Scaffold this motif. Sequence first.
Motif, PDB file in Angstrom:
ATOM      1  N   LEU A   1      -0.516  -7.459   3.911  1.00 41.72           N
ATOM      2  CA  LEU A   1      -1.921  -7.064   3.755  1.00 41.72           C
ATOM      3  C   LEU A   1      -2.104  -5.965   2.685  1.00 41.72           C
ATOM      4  O   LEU A   1      -1.174  -5.188   2.454  1.00 41.72           O
ATOM      5  N   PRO A   2      -3.284  -5.853   2.047  1.00 37.79           N
ATOM      6  CA  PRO A   2      -3.578  -4.807   1.082  1.00 37.79           C
ATOM      7  C   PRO A   2      -3.977  -3.511   1.783  1.00 37.79           C
ATOM      8  O   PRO A   2      -4.907  -3.467   2.589  1.00 37.79           O
ATOM      9  N   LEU A   3      -3.304  -2.425   1.447  1.00 38.69           N
ATOM     10  CA  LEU A   3      -3.539  -1.126   2.057  1.00 38.69           C
ATOM     11  C   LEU A   3      -4.292  -0.212   1.113  1.00 38.69           C
ATOM     12  O   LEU A   3      -4.063  -0.202  -0.094  1.00 38.69           O
ATOM     13  N   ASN A   4      -5.187   0.577   1.689  1.00 39.02           N
ATOM     14  CA  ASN A   4      -5.779   1.697   0.985  1.00 39.02           C
ATOM     15  C   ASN A   4      -4.692   2.678   0.531  1.00 39.02           C
ATOM     16  O   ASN A   4      -3.649   2.769   1.164  1.00 39.02           O
ATOM     17  N   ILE A   5      -4.925   3.467  -0.517  1.00 36.20           N
ATOM     18  CA  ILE A   5      -3.927   4.426  -1.030  1.00 36.20           C
ATOM     19  C   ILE A   5      -3.447   5.433   0.032  1.00 36.20           C
ATOM     20  O   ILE A   5      -2.282   5.815   0.053  1.00 36.20           O
TER      21      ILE A   5
ATOM     22  N   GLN B   1      -7.671  -2.576   2.861  1.00 32.13           N
ATOM     23  CA  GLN B   1      -8.467  -2.453   1.630  1.00 32.13           C
ATOM     24  C   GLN B   1      -9.554  -3.529   1.430  1.00 32.13           C
ATOM     25  O   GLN B   1     -10.555  -3.274   0.768  1.00 32.13           O
TER      26      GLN B   1
ATOM     27  N   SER C   1     -12.036   0.463  -2.071  1.00 38.78           N
ATOM     28  CA  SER C   1     -12.089  -0.688  -1.156  1.00 38.78           C
ATOM     29  C   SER C   1     -13.322  -1.577  -1.336  1.00 38.78           C
ATOM     30  O   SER C   1     -13.451  -2.601  -0.668  1.00 38.78           O
TER      31      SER C   1
ATOM     32  N   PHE D   1      -5.219  -9.936  -2.954  1.00 41.73           N
ATOM     33  CA  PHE D   1      -6.304  -9.624  -2.017  1.00 41.73           C
ATOM     34  C   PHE D   1      -7.516  -8.853  -2.587  1.00 41.73           C
ATOM     35  O   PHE D   1      -8.415  -8.485  -1.834  1.00 41.73           O
TER      36      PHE D   1
ATOM     37  N   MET E   1      -6.161   2.702   6.336  1.00 43.51           N
ATOM     38  CA  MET E   1      -7.015   1.532   6.522  1.00 43.51           C
ATOM     39  C   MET E   1      -6.609   0.382   5.604  1.00 43.51           C
ATOM     40  O   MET E   1      -5.898   0.550   4.615  1.00 43.51           O
TER      41      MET E   1
ATOM     42  N   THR F   1      -5.821   0.188  -5.102  1.00 41.54           N
ATOM     43  CA  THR F   1      -5.697   0.839  -3.790  1.00 41.54           C
ATOM     44  C   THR F   1      -6.617   2.033  -3.582  1.00 41.54           C
ATOM     45  O   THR F   1      -6.852   2.405  -2.434  1.00 41.54           O
TER      46      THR F   1
END
Lengths: 110, 628, 628
Positions: B324-328, B334, C23, A103, B332, C20
């Motif tokens: 899904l890609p997550l923020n660290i 990413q 963004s 992604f 939220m 991560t």
Amino acid sequence: MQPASAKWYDRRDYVFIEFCVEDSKDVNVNFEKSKLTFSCLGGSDNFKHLNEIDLFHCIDPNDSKHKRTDRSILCCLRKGESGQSWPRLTKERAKLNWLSVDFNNWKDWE
Amino acid sequence: VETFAFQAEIAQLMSLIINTFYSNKEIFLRELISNSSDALDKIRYESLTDPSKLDSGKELHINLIPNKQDRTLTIVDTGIGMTKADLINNLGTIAKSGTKAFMEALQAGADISMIGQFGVGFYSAYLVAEKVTVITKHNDDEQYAWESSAGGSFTVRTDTGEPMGRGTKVILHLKEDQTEYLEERRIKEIVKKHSQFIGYPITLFVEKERKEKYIDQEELNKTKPIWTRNPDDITNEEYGEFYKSLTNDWEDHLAVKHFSVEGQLEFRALLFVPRRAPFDLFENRKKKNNIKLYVRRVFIMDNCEELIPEYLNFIRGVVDSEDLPLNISREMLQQSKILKVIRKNLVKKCLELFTELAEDKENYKKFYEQFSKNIKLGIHEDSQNRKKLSELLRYYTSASGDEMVSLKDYCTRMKENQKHIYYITGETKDQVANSAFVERLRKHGLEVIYMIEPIDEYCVQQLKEFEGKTLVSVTKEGLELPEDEEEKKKQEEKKTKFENLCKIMKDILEKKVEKVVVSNRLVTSPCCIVTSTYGWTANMERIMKAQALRDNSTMGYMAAKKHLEINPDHSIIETLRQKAEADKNDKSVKDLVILLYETALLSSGFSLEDPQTHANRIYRMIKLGLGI
Amino acid sequence: VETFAFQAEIAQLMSLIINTFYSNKEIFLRELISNSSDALDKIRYESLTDPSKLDSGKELHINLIPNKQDRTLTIVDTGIGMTKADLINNLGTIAKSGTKAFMEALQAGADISMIGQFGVGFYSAYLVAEKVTVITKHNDDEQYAWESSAGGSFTVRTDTGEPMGRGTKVILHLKEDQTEYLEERRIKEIVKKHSQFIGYPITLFVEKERKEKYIDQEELNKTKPIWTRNPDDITNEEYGEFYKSLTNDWEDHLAVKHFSVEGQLEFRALLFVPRRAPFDLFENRKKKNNIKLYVRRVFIMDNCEELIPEYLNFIRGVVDSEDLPLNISREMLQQSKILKVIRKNLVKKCLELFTELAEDKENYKKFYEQFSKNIKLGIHEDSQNRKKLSELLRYYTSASGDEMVSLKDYCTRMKENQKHIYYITGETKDQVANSAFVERLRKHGLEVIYMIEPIDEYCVQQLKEFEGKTLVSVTKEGLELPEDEEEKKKQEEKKTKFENLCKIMKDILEKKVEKVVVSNRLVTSPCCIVTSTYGWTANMERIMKAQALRDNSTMGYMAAKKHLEINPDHSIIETLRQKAEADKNDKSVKDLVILLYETALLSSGFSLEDPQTHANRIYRMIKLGLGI
Ligand SMILES: Nc1ncnc2c1ncn2[C@@H]1O[C@H](COP(=O)(O)OP(=O)(O)NP(=O)(O)O)[C@@H](O)[C@H]1O
Ligand SMILES: Nc1ncnc2c1ncn2[C@@H]1O[C@H](COP(=O)(O)OP(=O)(O)NP(=O)(O)O)[C@@H](O)[C@H]1O
């Protein structure tokens, strides 16, 4: 002995597969109309990775390629029909635990 | 050339994780409940092939145990536990996940899915903790305490305290300014917000009764994530108990869409139409969306205006995904291109829901009675779905007996000569239905759509055509009714014999109108004021004159040009002709013509530029009628 | 007990920074220009105590060199450079900052501030780069190239290529789909967004002239961070050159604050009032405010609704601080408390700006004729500041002509008996000034405020009092004017004369009005329609009946409860009393009482319940008058 962690994405003409092996050695890749195979030794310990990917749709071995880096190995596969959507990397509905979508480089190009 | 491995400055790397990753401290409890839910998933999965893994305890659960006396919050789970080597590796190594290293060992047929992957979330305990003790017991090793204040080191020792049998017990000794996490209302808030869909019972241990020695709030998550089940297997009662539990509503849902998207994105969603619109639905500018995004049953974000368009803000719902890609921070998502692909699928499945709801007329009445504004705001703002949304519209009409009909029902009744959908806009159903503009339309039996909310005017500007039939306002110049050639000849004779009167009335009404014209649209009214085609109607003009935060500069040119339409068959107008053709400058013609213009402004639904100069005319007529 | 030091899994830790933390990929140029501005600040500082530090090169600049033929983006930097040990330490160790280590070696008085502190910003290069080569020379060591793909190792070698004298050169070998960062305007966008105010010339070396062998775009940052200078030194031309550079407006700012806030939270700000309200000022629901937040001259965030309330959204501005806690992405702050203490100071000093601007009447007219919506929206929203914002209000009045006057000028002119500030609301100054309600105010010489925009009707719900004087609408019941006891005695005798007419009129007007009453607010109108004190005014109803996105059942609960007020001295009304005293059921009295109620609905600013039912009376009186 165990599949490499992989990230994947696609474009109109190509399917991209990053095998996430750092300081990788002895990288071997085989492209076939209906399949990909990847293997290498891991740089930390020489552990042998092997991934077999019986592909969702046909590809062209003559226009497919791979780049090794000390960060990852990136395969770029040529779709056998450009504009085919790929909803999954393999012909089976199998949930390969080591495989996820990239992604950072996924885009809905269609 | 010399080759070096990368290093890390562990003292400052820990300082990043504590001080810089997480924008709110409350998340520490979701990270430690996620680690317990993963520890429970690991032992649940290990027990499937070997029941002896549960001989040390069978009840997979989470306990939260705030202790106000010791400033301590303990989080206990009967999960897999950690061996001495798993403590030293997984709690001792920053960015190492024992969850990832377990997950990647499994075959593709495994039905497990675990929240952890970064190898950092445990350290978020030090947002609130002065010190952390992790008591733990795996099946294959002794009980150990691991203990640290994040001072660049941690200690491990064989535990001489109470025997756990199997599990882990994260004791947070809290900072003095962070003892708010020990209030049972606080824990309830944080667990309900972040963790109400964790697959294991999260019990909270509260207080002594005034007697229960330690009151359990039996579960904080006394609900199930039903969206992970197959939508054929769930009844409408099960969806209703979930809707009430998700929203705290006492009332049921009106309609539900439950679906999955599969592709590069894989996600599931529940979208609920609530029985009634929130009383604040467009006044609450802060709560922009009622969709919650989850990943692996843990909450990510909700009030993200990128998930659904502002006209769907009434849909209460859940979106959940495996990958899904997550923020660290995990607070939220990413990659913003993912929200666009979620939004495309949510909107497509909402409009499926509304067209499946529109098959069921009695439930569609209950829907449209409250969400009309949302469909019409959708036609105002969503240029792609405009066609699909146009079939959701319902309106009163001159042929419909205090009941609302679709544009397909209007088109079913259209006469073979009609190429246009006639509509009128105004303030009330009586004010439009009685109006001068519809007088000849209803004489022919031509149907007219009644538009009567202010949002109808913002909507109908985009609703230019339906099924190849052009929507035409009956209040705009040159209205084409399907007249005969004998009627067209009578209209040319009528325009001929009144040509001078229109010139005389345009001298009297100078600057007050663009022109005065003989009309096909009247029968019983002596005249009405229509607008030119290219500008605001009388209803749009009153509406824009009432928007507080609109720049007045646009009102100075978008206000359309007024045309006075004469009725040539009226006894006032025929008498006015006989006076105007006798004397162009008769004061009784000057008075008559301006009183007809001001009465036509009101009949047409404009305001007057001065109501008092008009009222003084009526008060003079009243004096003359009273003989004053 | 066994003690262990924490470790980190460098393979995963490096992957968190690349996946991560960040963004958006575009910031890789912000981080590498920040690392260059810090390397320039280091050698500039070392040159202050020993000038010979610059004999290896006296210029301090950043050059960006895209190279489309090789896919590299280069960032050359005539800064301090790195020795072999500084490459191996600071680029080789994750979360180690040579900037933090330099800054903490300094004397406490050192006049310097550097963007770096976390020790991870360099690895954001691997968002876009497949490989990075850092070529560098420090004054005290050979030229070295450090090189890595971020593959868990890096290489270093004595480079001996083209000699740099002293500086660094980060060469980013871009990934095959990240070559968008070689486009000249892509770079121009990213630099003018993130790094516009870096204290050193950022030069871009692109293509060829199509003639010089490259376009030497001498600066991307031609402008300077003017807010770091002393507020007393800058002239209005220098603030104007900056405002035009910051905003791309073609005209100067109207007014400016420059403030220095010092304490536990320290910041500087420039706040500019534009010369004109933006065309989209409230229409742009995405742009919450025009404030940009910076830390150490690097852009952190914009459009944050926590910096200033939405009524101040017109203020263009910079906020900059040495000291705020950044998130690991550097795209937001770690504490909302910091934004509240910023916002209190921003608002507190905007209301100083408007209070200082209000002394310069010609510039205050240029401000208020555009931003009065914002002041009134402020009095609606902002409860702490209504006492300040209501001194910024300007209105027309019945004794100012066409001059706008303040509530303090009204309070200066107020007659010695006035306990109230009388006001009236409507659609235009001409409707309002000639209204029926003001007739006896204007006869007694009492002054009335004229309120004309729809936002004025919201403003006076909250603006209940000014200087201890109650704001009184002249369109509401019980308007006691300052009055003599003999006139009150006659007024109660007039009520006594008319009680039968009021009851006869209430029987005719049943459910159309709550009451019929004799009143003193009239002189030459026969009657007017007045509301109850706790309902909507005749104008507030007109406005609320035109808000598109508002639930009419919920708001319409408090609609205008109408009273009819009779002028007892009018010849219509005294004649009507003599008729109503002759026969309570006279069809003449029934016609005049309905025609006076409908005329009074118009002159009082309501809509008619049906305009056609009214118009048919006027058309009837015309038929009778013409002998039809
Ligand atoms: N309650 C627990 N029971 C068993 N093992 C645990 C527990 N808490 C932490 N661990 C172990 O500690 C490892 C690292 O934990 P943690 O630091 O929370 O990162 P993570 O959960 O694995 N991934 P993330 O939450 O995305 O950062 C886990 O993978 C487990 O091996
Ligand atoms: N262009 C350069 N010239 C000289 N030294 C540099 C340069 N780029 C990086 N460095 C050094 O490398 C160190 C680490 O860099 P970096 O990883 O980018 O983190 P940082 O800039 O120090 N802190 P941050 O920007 O908050 O992430 C810096 O502190 C400097 O000591």
